[PDB]
Amino acid sequence: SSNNSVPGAPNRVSFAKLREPLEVPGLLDVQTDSFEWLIGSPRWRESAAERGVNPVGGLEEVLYELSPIEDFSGSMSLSFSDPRFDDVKAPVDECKDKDMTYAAPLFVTAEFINNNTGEIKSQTVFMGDFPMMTEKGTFIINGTERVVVSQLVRSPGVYFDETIDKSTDKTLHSVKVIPSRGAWLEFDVDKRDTVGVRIDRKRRQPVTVLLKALGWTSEQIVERFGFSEIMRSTLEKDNTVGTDEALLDIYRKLRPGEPPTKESAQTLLENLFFKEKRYDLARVGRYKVNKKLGLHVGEPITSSTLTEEDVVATIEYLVRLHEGQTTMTVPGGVEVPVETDDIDHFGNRRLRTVGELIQNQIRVGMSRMERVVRERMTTQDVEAITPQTLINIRPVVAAIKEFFGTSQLSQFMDQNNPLSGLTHKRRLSALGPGGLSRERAGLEVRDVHPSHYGRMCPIETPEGPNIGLIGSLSVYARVNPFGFIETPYRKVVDGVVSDEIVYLTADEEDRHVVAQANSPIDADGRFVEPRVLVRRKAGEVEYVPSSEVDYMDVSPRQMVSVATAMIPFLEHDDANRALMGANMQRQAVPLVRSEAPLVGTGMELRAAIDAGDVVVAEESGVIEEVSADYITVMHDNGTRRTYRMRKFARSNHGTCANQCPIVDAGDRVEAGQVIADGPCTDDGEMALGKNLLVAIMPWEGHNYEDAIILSNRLVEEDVLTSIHIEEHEIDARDTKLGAEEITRDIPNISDEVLADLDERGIVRIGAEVRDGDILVGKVTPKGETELTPEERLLRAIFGEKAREVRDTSLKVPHGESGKVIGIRVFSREDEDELPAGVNELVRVYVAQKRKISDGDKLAGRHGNKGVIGKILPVEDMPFLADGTPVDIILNTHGVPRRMNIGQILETHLGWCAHSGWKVDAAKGVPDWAARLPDELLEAQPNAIVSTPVFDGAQEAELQGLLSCTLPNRDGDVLVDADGKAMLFDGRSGEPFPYPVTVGYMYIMKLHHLVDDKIHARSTGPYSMITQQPLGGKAQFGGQRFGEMECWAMQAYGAAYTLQELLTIKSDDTVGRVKVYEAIVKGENIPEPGIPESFKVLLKELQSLCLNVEVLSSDGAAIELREGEDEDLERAAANLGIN
Amino acid sequence: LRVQGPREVQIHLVREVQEVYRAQGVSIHDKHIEVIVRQMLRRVTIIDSGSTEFLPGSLIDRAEFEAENRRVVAAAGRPVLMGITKASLATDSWLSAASFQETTRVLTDAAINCRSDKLNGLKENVIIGKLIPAGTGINRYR
Amino acid sequence: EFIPRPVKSSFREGLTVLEYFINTHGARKGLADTALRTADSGYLTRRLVDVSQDVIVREHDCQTERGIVVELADGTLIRDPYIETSAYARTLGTDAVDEAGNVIVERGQDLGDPEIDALLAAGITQVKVRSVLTCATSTGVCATCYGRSMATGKLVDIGEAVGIVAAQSIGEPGTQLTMGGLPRVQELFEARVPRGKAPIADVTGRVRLEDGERFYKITIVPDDGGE
Amino acid sequence: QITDWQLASNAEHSSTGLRSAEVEALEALPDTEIKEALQALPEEFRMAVYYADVEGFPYKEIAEIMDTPIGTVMSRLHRGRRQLRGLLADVARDRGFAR
Amino acid sequence: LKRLKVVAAFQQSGNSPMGMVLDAVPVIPPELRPMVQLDGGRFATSDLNDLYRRVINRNNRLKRLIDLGAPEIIVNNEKRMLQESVDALFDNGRRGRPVTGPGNRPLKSLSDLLKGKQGRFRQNLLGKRVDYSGRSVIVVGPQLKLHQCGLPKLMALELFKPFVMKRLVDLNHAQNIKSAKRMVERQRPQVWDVLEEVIAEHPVLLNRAPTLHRLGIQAFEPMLVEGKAIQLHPLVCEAFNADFDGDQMAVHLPLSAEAQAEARILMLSSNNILSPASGRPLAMPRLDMVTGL
Amino acid sequence: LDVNFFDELRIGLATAEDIRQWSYGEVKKPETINYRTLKPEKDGLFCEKIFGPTRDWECYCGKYKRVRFKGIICERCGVEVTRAKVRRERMGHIEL
DNA sequence: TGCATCCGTGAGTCGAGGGT
DNA sequence: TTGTGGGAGCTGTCACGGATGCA
RNA sequence: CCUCGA
Ligand SMILES: [Mg+2]
Ligand SMILES: [Zn+2]
Ligand SMILES: [Zn+2]
């Protein structure tokens, strides 16, 4: 009920009934655990040594693999040690302002040894500027904040599957030996009875060729595989028999068009798999195969490469799999079970987090540099070389820069609001390099796998193409050092549920039986009833008694993600609308004033602080000073801490990130208390919408087909008003005809059009701008031939004599407006980093206050979306008996069909919390209220409450509260014990003849707003190749009248409409002009010419040596080129000539 | 087709397709499915070219086959059922075939055969920006 | 496959955690299945459009007497399930007269709802209708054979591009086809030798059915005594 | 395929840019303010101004036209420029030529 | 028979098979393979230029080797390389490894410019981007008649821009056409009274994608509306499969007399009431209307 | 201006003689444009001499910038003084 | 010369913004 | 223009038809 | 191309 583990946190009284023994971890730990590892931070250092004392970091690991670096003659050796970091070069806000990368310089200790002269030359060498991770778990890369998303990849190991059939109906078995780094190794069976080794996509050589290649003579190979007659037929049908002859055959089959050599086949074959330089099983990949086959059960993980005994054990496992023997024992092995492997099981599907992705790119750069180091050791005169001379850090810098710059895994941070950014960092992506590709994305990788329970949320996933490919980490989940996901369970010993938390992966889980968090327990901690539902291994549902229950869920919502766990009455919503609810929560736009929900969960608070868009007291103290600009905390230590507020910052997606203090001067704040609210937070909790008074009824068809009706109060009181900030950027640069100039002196412009610019030509701070307004005057040198006849007469008449230019000024785009709130200019005359050729660079920041409008998109938390159909006067809205008009009217027809009855339950509870209640405790405690906490028997108006998912307010408890609803100021009970009310039609005055459900529903403002989406075009730019209109509202584009649309026009038989669309509205470069000409002069629209894209087509065919000619009716080819002279008799002559 | 004749194949196909759509409660009138099926039964394979220039086994439009036979007397053709994709790639409009799919192959063969596109069809007049030969674009109306 | 355990809970009661988790499987399997099925249906529609696009109404009437026979209807007539898609909107080939002859609908009428009602009421259980299958027009079809324009309700106008309308009418509901279904529609329209080919009798005669073990041996002796 | 945002960005710093059909329609229609100012001038003044100021003919070659010596052509040119500057005075202010 | 198709085709047409071997490679005009400067001082080129450039490098190196009388093996290497680079230029990836650009992507060759929904046929000839068109969110607006739609003011003003311009000059609101343009662009009030004039009885086509059948495009008479959203009559929803949960729709302005006439006659909302697939009406009451009646 | 009534559209194979009859000049160099002046190198993939002028009525060396000179071929630079439209319709070739 | 394998084809429409 | 020197990813797709190659 | 919208 208290949730007081967070200081100063609001008192959200909770309907929960089960105890949460474990707190939700740091929700950014998925990223901070990873990047602190790569760096080898004292945080990681303490923890890694605090767990069970081999403390190697990611960079240290890259360096010990690389070193020592020996020369061909074994003479000299370069070795790397001790990764160290300088301070950060610039603060985050400075990198964001100057388009820089938040980074800290990286140093290493490079020791060069020369065994010939015995001398040793240490040094401290600078590897490069190492991009750094913020306190929020992100990256600033060229001035834009970013997230590296964890990637789902298949763990290194040995995996067997059963492919159902070839052309025949014969059951085949395969295996891929997939390492962390190196070459692939495969074995399979055919339609015929042979056992072959496909390797690096080369042809199918019988696996016996590899047996004798390793040294296993024919008699020694026959002995082990004697029980398997498929191997005997493979050797009876074998081509040759002998060690070196099977070795040289490997070489000829490996190199097409290359003379084989025995001595050169012996070295590169041990270099493919057994040599640690080119081939390395991961520590995980070693652990996976030694548990799969049972070879080395004493944890000697020191050496991790492909070994002969493991290869022979995999061959014997593969061949015994055809027999299907449940058991197997390899020489020295231990009773391993023989089965196929599931590629989607989360014990075989690890994820590579941010630290590991960066490590794998660092390793690449290091290897490039090393191949440069070895080449320097000879060209340079020895005894004069230094560690500084061998090392070339350009490849490493380029490898880092490329990764954050091009990787699908380094992503533009989704920050519509704290929740968007928070889940983005908790994402588990499937695509990427070294992962699977989209053309390989079958339907089965996208399904909810039984192993995802408690690790990957089954609700939150994209509706569109990326479905099942983008999933988000579960609440209590955590990634282990091997890259697997564990989830905590309570240890159950002899039917008593203890408080021992034990984290298990999917593998460790299938060996036990897991009960549920909602399970009856006595006061001591014992299971009440013997037989109840549990999760049988491989994800099944059974009823075994509690004497055999090993572990129990530490909580409900254990399976669910952050955004999902924020949906009240989730368990009353079908998974489709529930998914729709999680996803729309991450599209809520921040509102000018934020307002926490009356009906919430306990997840808003704990997600708002972890998301990091709130300001949080690092140490206890007293507020010394507080402005809208910063907050100072005098700790009892005597030190001060100050936190500058983000004031009206532009998020990546254009929403207002405006922090605001919630402390006062003199207040006592504890460590971790919230000092100030963020974009969608209210007093520390996530506030994504507003509490709206809803009626559920149809209303004159204005909420037909999910449309929404709003009271005009929400315009007048700015309850759904939101602030949106655009950044308009233009630069001045060098041109083939001169250099560009940012000037207030623009051709063909009145002084009144420039009234709002300053003296330089930049719009003035605080101006109100509209479509077509200049923000930065700019001119580009055009040649003389580009002056129009008029522009050339006035220039000569008045003798302008200034170089002729084109008006290439930055304007306000169509359909937007606002106040200039910020100007930022960068000059080349000043020493300012600009791209090559760029002289002046200025950004104008425009802010609009967006009132909620017709066409804006709203939704609740239950997937109940709609756009606004009509905003009615407050007097027209159906109103309650006391005159209160409702705020929003949701159509009844939409609710039952979509299975999100959670919205109705919320509406009921929303009303209960708004009115407050007093449960009759006089004679005792009613039966429905029995399980209610004492802090919920009464509640003051507008109380704040939690409905934890799967542990929320039960149907009986909710229906009770609708009885004890406190009345309004006049003693009136406006909402009866069903949740319905009597409303008057504010248009006629007559009452509506039946009681309507009314109550309070949390309604968010989604970021799909008319202002962004309205677009129109009569005429504009055209693409240069095709001459068709450009695409996109941003480019003033044209709508695409596509293939299926032409079928529609055709099916109507609208010949001329189809022609006109396809010639003079798109592609006829002369008919375009002739048509605008015709409309402006009030004449008929002229006849279409030839689409320029057909011309382009013909030209591309000739480029393929195809002689395409257009023929006349009877004559020869038609001339498709036009004349150089046209309309001279009229155009020049129309300015008064004859 | 080779047993009960083309008129029976068309009945067979319309009913089997209509049955698949029926099992999912979908109302498609038969005339649409007939309009489609009709286009599958417009050619004939050639078993022997008695006096004609036709290759044996090549598929020829029935009107083409018959109208070329008539001006050779002054020819062994059996009805053939082809699928829609194959009936499409085998049109007299090389432009239509190239704009449909498998463009490299259509264009190669059309080059080797020095094909000339009459530009008769809807798609072809669309591509060149002429009035389509349907609806308000046919001559009796325009 | 159906999990042997059911979700005993309704959504008013609120599902448990396991019930919700396992309901997820079917939910997402459906969302992904629809993502695939829509592309399949779209490719099918594009191929249909291309194969039929050149089909147009060229003349008013080819005047043929060919057509197809349609069913309309123990001790009472029962309406035929598929009158709506094979008999309604057709053009009558031959006059419909009952026993004790009466011209119920004349040759070349719309066969609209009033006509179908009058037909059933007078006891007519079969009708011969013009069809696009039996149309004799050189290229394309004649109006009289096509029938009424489904859009207008009057007989199809001359310039109509009925191929595109037909391809659109067949494609548009394709996404409704689940599991066979759309695979079988594609199998038929692409004119392939089907899976599980059921052979037909090549010639009229008597059959000898030889029972093997997993192997059936059908033989047919012709009535003409042929091979 | 270079994108539309790329074609547009490039056009932002180019000497011609992606011109609309409307832009080119109006350039092919009369500039009403300019046409009437020119039609105000006498025929010979208008001709000597047109050739020199629009068609850039050198002074001896525009003398080759109109069949008049160089002095006559240059007198007509300077005086027609003056007169046309008498008119067009608001057009030069409406546009940026007053600076 | 297979080989005869080729041979007879080559003899029946008077073109020779020599054309199957090239001594000269054509070069497509440079506007069709553009090059543009980008923010950053870097350039963007079409893949075609990299391919032609490799062809040129290899042909020139071959010429250099032939002049230098290089070993026959090296000159054969250069000849095979020239052949493979012309293979890339014509159809990359068809034989062997595709020529790649940065990030390992295969360079789209002259063959790719024609194939698929990206190629010229399906992307630029069978469908195009068009002028006099817009798009916005749809709301219900039950006050409409079947033949009508709510078209926002800011959309209608841009769509009819030259019409309102000619009218603004007809009446003395604008003294010439340039002022008419600037007036429509500054959104001076005089335009609005004129707007309702020009758009009167001038149909527009509305389209919702995916256009599954011809009723996915329908003409309506536009009613100027307050707001930034299109208002869609509740009875045409079925035909468009349009609900109002965020759907957007497109607007197209027919210009010529023939296009306007096809819109008023063939495509008029109230003239397309029956499914052209089943012949039955689609524009019937749905759900709310139903519970009403 | 084409009245848009074509009877037929025929393909054949291009003869090297056809490929040369199309071409306005052989491209010989791999350079595209100079980094300093952003101008198209001579005999390159964007050569103005064989393809056409980048700017209307302008020549490469700048001797002719006028609609007055119209259709003349600059003797110093070989570029034709015409509309830049031509750079979308003028093929080159490569002698192998 | 008779097939088995391999290879080449195709895999919905329209939007928004970001921008190596 | 001189002691030695061989890539980075890749696969977690699938149904269909007909050439191509092998023996 | 990525992420998203219907
Ligand atoms: Mg929708
Ligand atoms: Zn007919
Ligand atoms: Zn020159």
In SS3 terms, C130-167 reads as ECCCCCCCCCCEEHHHHCECCCCCCECCCCCCHHHHHH
Q: What is the C-alpha to C-alpha distance for residues C5 and B128, in angstroms, rounded to an integer? A: 62
The length of chain E, given as a count of residues: 293
Q: What is the C-alpha to C-alpha distance for residues D55 and D37, in angstroms, rounded to an integer? A: 18
Name which of E43, E176, E182 to mutate to probe chain D: the one with the most chain D Cβ atoms within 10 A of its Cβ: E176
Chains D and F touch, contact meaning at least 3 pairs of CB atoms under 8 angstroms apart: yes
Bridge pairing between strands A689-696 and A888-890 = parallel
Q: What backbone phi and psi angles, to 5 degrees, belong to A137?
A: 75, 40
Q: What backbone phi and psi angles, to 5 degrees, belong to B98?
A: -65, -40
Answer whether F11's CB lies under 8 Å from F27's CB: no
Q: Both ends of chain B: CA-CA distance in Å?
A: 41
A656: which strand partners? A650
A79: which strand partners? A111
Q: What is the C-alpha to C-alpha distance for residues A928 and A1131, in angstroms, rounded to an integer? A: 90
Shortest distance, CA D10 to any CA of chain E (angstroms): 6
Q: What is the C-alpha to C-alpha distance for residues A428 and A152, in angstroms, rounded to an integer? A: 6
Of A558, A1090, A20, residue with least CA distance to C16? A558
Q: Both ends of chain F: CA-CA distance in Å?
A: 37
Q: How far is the CA of C217 from the C1' of I4 (A)?
A: 60
For nucleotide H6, the protein residue with its alpha carbon nearest to C1' is A268
Beta strands in A170-211 (DSSP E): 172-178, 185-189, 195-197, 205-206
Residue A93 CB contacts under 8 Å (≥ 6 apart), including other chains: none
CA distances from A82 to A57, A64, A106, A321 (A): 10, 10, 10, 48
- Six-digit token string for A469: 């490919």
Q: What is the C-alpha to C-alpha distance for residues A56 and C96, in angstroms, rounded to an integer? A: 94
Q: What is the C-alpha to C-alpha distance for residues A460 and A472, in angstroms, rounded to an integer? A: 7
| Three-class DSSP category at A477 | coil
Task: Compute the half-sphere exposure of residue A400: CA atoms within 13 Å on the CB side of its CA.
Answer: 20
> Is the dihedral angle over the CA atoms A1096, A1101, A1105, A1108 positive or is it negative?
negative
Helical packing angle, A1043-1052 and C162-171, nearest 10°:
130
Q: What is the C-alpha to C-alpha distance for residues A597 and A686, in angstroms, rounded to an integer? A: 9
Identity at A174, one-letter amino acid code: S
Q: How far is the CA of A167 from the C1' of G6 (A)?
A: 14
Bridge pairing between strands A945-946 and A599-600 = parallel
List helix spans (H) across A380-518: 387-390, 394-406, 418-425, 506-510
Q: What is the C-alpha to C-alpha distance for residues F8 and D51, in angstroms, rounded to an integer? A: 47
- The range of the structural domain enclosing residue A222 comes to 154-351
- Six-digit token string for B120: 């008769």
Within E 91-110, residues with CB less than 7 Å from strand H: 97, 104
Of A738, A730, A719, A723, residue with least CA distance to A783? A738
Q: What is the C-alpha to C-alpha distance for residues A611 and A423, in angstroms, rounded to an integer? A: 9
Of A55, E37, A118, residue with least CA distance to F35? E37
Q: What backbone phi and psi angles, to 5 degrees, belong to A291?
A: -90, -25
Q: What is the C-alpha to C-alpha distance for residues D66 and E274, in angstroms, rounded to an integer? A: 72
Neighbours of A338 (CB within 10 A): 18
Of A512, A494, A495, residue with least CA distance to A503? A512
CA B19: distance to chain centroid? 25
Q: Both ends of chain A: CA-CA distance in Å?
A: 93
A186 closest-nt by C1' vs CA: H11
Q: What is the C-alpha to C-alpha distance for residues A117 and A742, in angstroms, rounded to an integer? A: 64
A168 touches chain D (CB under 8 A): no
Q: Which residues of D touch E38 (CB under 8 A)?
A: 6, 9-10
A796 touches chain D (CB under 8 A): yes
Asked whether residue A470, judged by its CB, lies under 7 Å from any atom of the DNA or RNA strand I, the reply is yes
Of C56, C84, C49, residue with least CA distance to C158? C56
- Six-digit token string for C121: 């009421």
Question: E touches which chains (3+ CB pairs under 8 A)?
Answer: A, B, C, D, F
Secondary element (H or E) of residue A705: none
Q: What backbone phi and psi angles, to 5 degrees, belong to B140?
A: -60, -20
| Three-class DSSP category at A747 | coil
Q: What is the C-alpha to C-alpha distance for residues D25 and A1070, in angstroms, rounded to an integer? A: 10
Query: What region does C142 belong to: left with phi over 0, alpha with psi -120 to 50, or beta?
Result: beta
Answer whether A489's CB lies under 8 Å from A508's CB: no
Answer whether A189's CB lies under 8 Å from A230's CB: yes
- As a three-state string, the secondary structure of D14-76 is CCCCCCCHHHHHHHHCCCHHHHHHHHHCCHHHHHHHHHHHHHCCCHHHHHHCCCCCHHHHHHH
| Three-class DSSP category at A146 | strand
Nearest 10 degrees: CA dihedral of C32, C35, C41, C43?
-120
How far does residue E241's CA lie from ligand 1's centre (Å)? 8
Sheet holding A13-14, edge to edge: A13-14, A945-946, A599-600
Q: What is the C-alpha to C-alpha distance for residues E79 and E90, in angstroms, rounded to an integer? A: 17
**Sole residue written with tokens 């008769």:** B120
Q: What is the C-alpha to C-alpha distance for residues C140 and C158, in angstroms, rounded to an integer? A: 11
Nearest 10 degrees: CA dihedral of E186, E192, E193, E199?
120
CA distances from B48 to B44, B52, B58, B76, E3 (A): 12, 9, 10, 5, 18
CA triplet C60, C63, C66: central angle to 5 degrees?
Answer: 125
Report CB contact under 8 Å: B117, F6. Answer: no
Q: What is the DSSP string of C10-79?
A: -TTT---HHHHHHHHHHHHHHHHHHHHHHHHHHHHHHHHHHHHTT--EEES-------EEEE----S---
Of A466, A272, A433, A412, residue with least CA distance to A352? A433
Q: What is the C-alpha to C-alpha distance for residues E125 and A852, in angstroms, rounded to an integer? A: 41
Identity at A253, one-letter amino acid code: K
| Three-class DSSP category at A103 | strand
> Per residue in A470-505, is it b (16+ CB within 10 Å) or e — as a string?
bbbbbbbbbbeeebbbbbbbbebeebebeeeeebbb
- Six-digit token string for A77: 């050796």
Bridge pairing between strands E230-231 and E133-139 = parallel
Nearest 10 degrees: CA dihedral of E67, E68, E73, E77?
-60
Q: What is the C-alpha to C-alpha distance for residues A63 and A61, in angstroms, rounded to an integer? A: 5
Identity at A433, one-letter amino acid code: P
Question: A touches which chains (3+ CB pairs under 8 A)?
Answer: B, C, D, E, F
**Sole residue written with tokens 């059974």:** A542
Shortest distance, CA B29 to any CA of chain A (angstroms): 17
Answer whether A150's CB lies under 8 Å from A30's CB: yes
Sheet holding A660-661, edge to edge: A615-616, A674-677, A660-661
DSSP assigned state of A896: G
The length of chain C, given as a count of residues: 227
For nucleotide I2, the protein residue with its alpha carbon nearest to C1' is A408
Answer whether A564's CB lies under 8 Å from A545's CB: no
Of C66, C89, C79, C73, residue with least CA distance to C156? C89
Identity at A570, one-letter amino acid code: L
DSSP assigned state of A525: S
Longest dimension (CA), chain A: 110
How far does residue C63's CA lie from ligand 2's centre (Å)? 7
| Three-class DSSP category at A357 | helix
DSSP assigned state of B1: -
CA A227: distance to chain centroid? 52
Residue C186 burial (CB < 10 Å; 0-12/13-18/19+)? buried
Of B43, B33, B42, B32, residue with least CA distance to B12? B33
Q: What is the C-alpha to C-alpha distance for residues A1121 and F24, in angstroms, rounded to an integer? A: 15
Q: What is the C-alpha to C-alpha distance for residues A1088 and A1074, in angstroms, rounded to an integer? A: 10
Q: What is the C-alpha to C-alpha distance for residues E154 and F79, in angstroms, rounded to an integer? A: 47
Residue A322 CB contacts under 8 Å (≥ 6 apart), including other chains: A173, A189, A228, A230
Q: What is the C-alpha to C-alpha distance for residues A679 and A651, in angstroms, rounded to an integer? A: 10
Of A698, A610, A37, residue with least CA distance to A355? A37
Of E141, C42, B12, residue with least CA distance to A870? E141
Q: What is the C-alpha to C-alpha distance for residues E97 and A946, in angstroms, rounded to an integer? A: 60
Answer whether F23's CB lies under 8 Å from F92's CB: yes
List helix spans (H) across A470-569: 506-510
Q: Which residues of B touch F5 (CB under 8 A)?
A: 130
Q: What is the DSSP string of A412-436?
A: E---SSHHHHHHHHTEEE-BSTTSB
Identity at A860, one-letter amino acid code: G
Answer whether A597's CB lies under 8 Å from A665's CB: no
- As a three-state string, the secondary structure of chain E is CHHHHHHHHHHHCCCCHHHHCCCEEEECCHHHCCEEECCCCCEEECHHHHHHHHHHHHHHHHHHHHHCCCCHHHHHHHHHHHHHHHHHHHHCCCCCCCCEEHHHEECCCCCCCCCCCCCHHHHHHCCEECCCEEEEEEECCCCCCCCEEEEEHHHHHHHCHHHHHHHHHHCCCCCCHHHHHHHHHHCCCHHHHHHHHHHCCCCEEEECCCCCCHHHEEEEEEEEECCCCEECCCCCHHHHCCCCCCCEEEEECCCCHHHHHHHHHCCEHHHCCECCCCCCECCCCCCHHHHHC
Q: What is the C-alpha to C-alpha distance for residues A907 and A895, in angstroms, rounded to an integer? A: 12
- Six-digit token string for E176: 């010439």
- CATH classification at residue A208: 3.90.1110.10
| Three-class DSSP category at B2 | coil
> Is the dihedral angle over the CA atoms A590, A596, A601, A607 positive or is it negative?
positive
Q: What is the C-alpha to C-alpha distance for residues A617 and A339, in angstroms, rounded to an integer? A: 54
| Three-class DSSP category at A175 | strand
Q: What backbone phi and psi angles, to 5 degrees, belong to D54?
A: -100, -50
Q: What backbone phi and psi angles, to 5 degrees, belong to A635?
A: -65, 155
**Sole residue written with tokens 């080919």:** C197
Answer whether E205's CB lies under 8 Å from E267's CB: yes
Experimental method: X-ray
Q: What is the C-alpha to C-alpha distance for residues C177 and C183, in angstroms, rounded to an integer? A: 9
| Three-class DSSP category at B66 | helix
Neighbours of A88 (CB within 10 A): 16
Answer whether A915's CB lies under 8 Å from A975's CB: yes
Bridge pairing between strands A865-872 and A708-711 = parallel
- Six-digit token string for A1079: 């409309």
CA distances from F56 to A195, A783, E28 (A): 71, 10, 20
DSSP assigned state of A28: T
Identity at A493, one-letter amino acid code: V
CA distances from A817 to A251, A812, E137 (A): 70, 7, 20
Of A728, A134, A261, residue with least CA distance to A269? A261
Q: What backbone phi and psi angles, to 5 degrees, belong to A193?
A: -100, 80
